[PDB]
Amino acid sequence: HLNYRQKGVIDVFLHAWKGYRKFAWGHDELKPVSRSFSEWFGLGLTLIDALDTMWILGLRKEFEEARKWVSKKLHFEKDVDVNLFESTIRILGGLLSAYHLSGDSLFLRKAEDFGNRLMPAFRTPSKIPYSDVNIGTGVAHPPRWTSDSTVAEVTSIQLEFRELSRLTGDKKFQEAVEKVTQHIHGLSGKKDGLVPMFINTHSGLFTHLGVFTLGARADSYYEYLLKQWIQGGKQETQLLEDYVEAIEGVRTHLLRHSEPSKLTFVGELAHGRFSAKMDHLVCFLPGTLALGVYHGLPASHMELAQELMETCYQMNRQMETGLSPEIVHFNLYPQPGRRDVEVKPADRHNLLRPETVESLFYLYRVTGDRKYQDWGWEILQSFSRFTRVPSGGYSSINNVQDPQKPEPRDKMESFFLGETLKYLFLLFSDDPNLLSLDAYVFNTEAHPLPIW
Ligand SMILES: [La+3]
């Protein structure tokens, strides 16, 4: 049943996992070069993020060992501040997917415990949640570096809280996140469906007006408009309307073409001024566009999806290591001697992020064009060649443009095993019934949830 490239993904997962087991078991993140670990939640983050990946890959003895850790060692009462968004997409989503795939009620019981501890974040005058909540003390607060919550953060928790309410029969989770969605539906200050990056919890209004990105702090707002619509059985038309409007806004304001290859890319807008800067995070968008087309969105979305998938591929393959940097810049006009994909010296790191292989999965599932599998295999071979740590694990690197000295940062992010390897395994599968597009939607940390 497993094909050659899938066996390759499993090889990579188990080399990653033996570093995690040997040097970071029960801890949030492996630091593979130093053979140690780091904590920021203190909640076995990498383990929880990889539960469903282990199940999907057939790694059942490993899953059972991880299940025993959740049963005995996972406890939520420590005095620790957590980011509501990261907690929700990683830990709440990871537990809910582990429940659905395994059927083991332990994961749901941990999910409900955790969900309850996140609820104080929503006690704001506007009901738009605070950014941070202490799962042990019950205090929630805004960040220190800014007074506002982040738009993607308060709009990328809905799938998880909705599903938790459906499974527990406790309406408070769904009611809290749906208030956020309805309120933002009615806010002023969008540009043709494009949202600002920040939102004030006291006034409920957008801040940082006139500055529009589809990268960090805005990207998954658009992703979850579509995915919530799919999740709820395509009856919540306001979600679809705001999604359709947003894609037209992307077309009108953010799309330009590179030189020399005329690649379609998405840039940023600040107070009317275009910037040809594209986070690797924006590479979520071709996958989301294609997912929409599978579910009835117009064919123009697939035209755009295929152009952007090619661009995102080139963001990887035009680098010396074959791995995309964190941020790329594009030239609107010809520059002698330059490739399409420019990268600032400070932006040359790769943190093993999943968004290109994320989108290849959907492009393959919807089109059947096997070149998207070939491109994913190419990217995985680059990960193997430049980020592998002999003792175990894989590391973020500081320089995708120096194949002799990529400069490991000594960290394996939980989304390498939660997302990057999961999307690759699915991309290579010969089975369209494996986590079918008709039956599940993935949350923004690649944790599948059932369509209602
Ligand atoms: La994501």
Side-chain angles (χ1 to χ4, degrees):
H1 39 45
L2 292 167
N3 61 45
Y4 179 91
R5 293 179 166 168
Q6 283 179 306
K7 300 178 196 170
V9 173
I10 288 165
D11 290 348
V12 175
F13 185 104
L14 292 169
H15 182 74
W17 200 241
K18 84 166 175 198
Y20 182 73
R21 294 183 72 261
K22 287 188 305 189
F23 305 120
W25 182 254
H27 301 290
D28 282 340
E29 308 152 331
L30 170 70
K31 299 183 62 67
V33 185
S34 58
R35 303 177 303 280
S36 180
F37 62 84
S38 52
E39 303 278 33
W40 52 307
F41 293 127
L43 296 173
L45 180 57
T46 286
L47 188 155
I48 298 188
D49 236 21
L51 284 169
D52 61 358
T53 304
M54 283 184 281
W55 188 273
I56 293 160
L57 269 56
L59 309 184
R60 294 315 168 69
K61 301 295 189 173
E62 288 76 14
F63 188 98
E64 171 191 34
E65 182 184 57
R67 189 269 184 203
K68 184 179 204 291
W69 182 91
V70 174
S71 174
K72 292 170 182 303
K73 311 294 184 75
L74 183 67
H75 313 294
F76 295 124
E77 85 278 347
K78 296 296 182 182
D79 184 343
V80 60
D81 279 0
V82 305
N83 182 269
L84 175 66
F85 156 80
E86 298 282 3
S87 303
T88 295
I89 66 170
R90 305 203 195 199
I91 295 173
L92 179 51
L95 291 168
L96 288 161
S97 290
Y99 169 67
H100 275 299
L101 300 184
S102 68
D104 189 332
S105 71
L106 162 71
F107 297 114
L108 179 56
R109 295 174 205 273
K110 294 297 185 183
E112 185 171 21
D113 185 4
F114 194 61
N116 272 296
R117 294 169 182 279
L118 295 180
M119 288 300 299
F122 294 98
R123 287 141 199 187
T124 68
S126 71
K127 309 307 178 175
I128 300 293
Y130 284 123
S131 63
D132 297 350
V133 59
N134 191 297
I135 60 182
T137 71
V139 181
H141 58 79
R144 290 119 164 262
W145 69 274
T146 182
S147 49
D148 299 328
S149 291
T150 287
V151 169
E153 286 186 18
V154 311
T155 57
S156 311
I157 57 179
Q158 277 65 21
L159 300 178
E160 302 80 349
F161 274 69
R162 273 152 64 99
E163 178 60 12
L164 187 58
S165 276
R166 193 187 66 82
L167 292 172
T168 64
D170 184 349
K171 64 172 169 54
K172 72 175 172 264
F173 307 114
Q174 175 169 21
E175 288 191 340
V177 297
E178 291 190 354
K179 297 170 73 169
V180 174
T181 305
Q182 175 56 26
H183 171 79
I184 287 165
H185 174 76
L187 282 177
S188 316
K190 303 172 180 174
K191 182 164 189 64
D192 286 321
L194 306 173
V195 297
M197 292 166 51
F198 294 94
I199 180 164
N200 186 262
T201 58
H202 182 73
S203 71
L205 306 179
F206 286 133
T207 68
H208 294 246
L209 301 177
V211 179
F212 300 102
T213 185
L214 250 72
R217 304 205 184 260
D219 46 6
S220 49
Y221 156 84
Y222 306 97
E223 177 195 4
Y224 270 30
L225 290 179
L226 181 62
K227 281 181 178 180
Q228 281 183 84
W229 178 73
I230 298 164
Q231 182 192 43
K234 298 170 184 163
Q235 293 299 309
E236 296 160 296
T237 303
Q238 290 186 357
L239 298 168
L240 180 67
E241 294 165 359
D242 297 347
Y243 174 76
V244 164
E245 180 184 21
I247 304 307
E248 286 319 294
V250 169
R251 283 192 171 287
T252 304
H253 307 294
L254 307 182
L255 294 184
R256 300 295 182 77
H257 295 99
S258 77
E259 293 291 346
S261 301
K262 310 295 166 50
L263 302 164
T264 303
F265 70 92
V266 179
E268 303 183 330
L269 199 60
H271 309 290
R273 182 207 274 249
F274 182 85
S275 168
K277 178 267 225 183
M278 185 173 160
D279 301 347
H280 182 261
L281 290 167
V282 180
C283 286
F284 91 95
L285 183 64
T288 287
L289 288 165
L291 173 67
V293 174
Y294 181 77
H295 286 286
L297 276 292
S300 64
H301 281 34
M302 175 63 74
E303 299 184 74
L304 183 49
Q306 291 185 34
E307 294 175 15
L308 290 179
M309 191 76 260
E310 170 84 45
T311 299
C312 283
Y313 170 58
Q314 293 297 333
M315 292 167 51
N316 292 268
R317 75 154 293 288
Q318 294 192 13
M319 297 297 101
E320 291 92 308
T321 55
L323 294 177
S324 182
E326 179 89 344
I327 302 168
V328 306
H329 288 249
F330 291 99
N331 295 314
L332 296 170
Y333 293 96
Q335 305 305 328
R338 290 320 186 100
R339 299 170 185 258
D340 295 272
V341 187
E342 305 271 27
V343 50
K344 300 169 69 172
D347 297 339
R348 298 195 182 116
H349 45 288
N350 177 286
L351 310 184
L352 313 179
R353 292 193 192 272
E355 293 81 18
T356 291
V357 299
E358 178 186 1
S359 284
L360 290 170
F361 160 69
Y362 294 110
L363 266 297
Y364 181 64
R365 277 281 175 104
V366 180
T367 72
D369 192 336
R370 296 190 169 272
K371 78 182 175 181
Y372 298 124
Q373 304 186 301
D374 296 344
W375 297 357
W377 182 246
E378 182 175 346
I379 286 167
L380 178 58
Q381 291 179 308
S382 290
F383 280 133
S384 288
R385 184 157 50 145
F386 298 106
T387 76
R388 187 184 181 274
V389 183
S391 58
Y394 298 77
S395 180
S396 306
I397 57 169
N398 209 45
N399 195 345
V400 302
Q401 293 191 303
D402 194 338
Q404 182 180 159
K405 295 206 301 84
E407 198 167 56
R409 297 189 159 200
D410 187 30
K411 186 172 171 178
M412 189 173 73
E413 298 279 357
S414 76
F415 50 74
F416 181 63
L417 302 187
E419 304 199 58
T420 308
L421 291 195
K422 186 193 283 116
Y423 284 126
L424 283 172
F425 183 87
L426 298 172
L427 167 66
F428 298 142
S429 173
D430 296 313
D431 185 6
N433 183 35
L434 175 56
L435 296 184
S436 168
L437 265 41
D438 290 309
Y440 300 85
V441 293
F442 288 89
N443 92 328
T444 195
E445 196 88 3
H447 294 314
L449 304 167
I451 297 170
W452 300 347

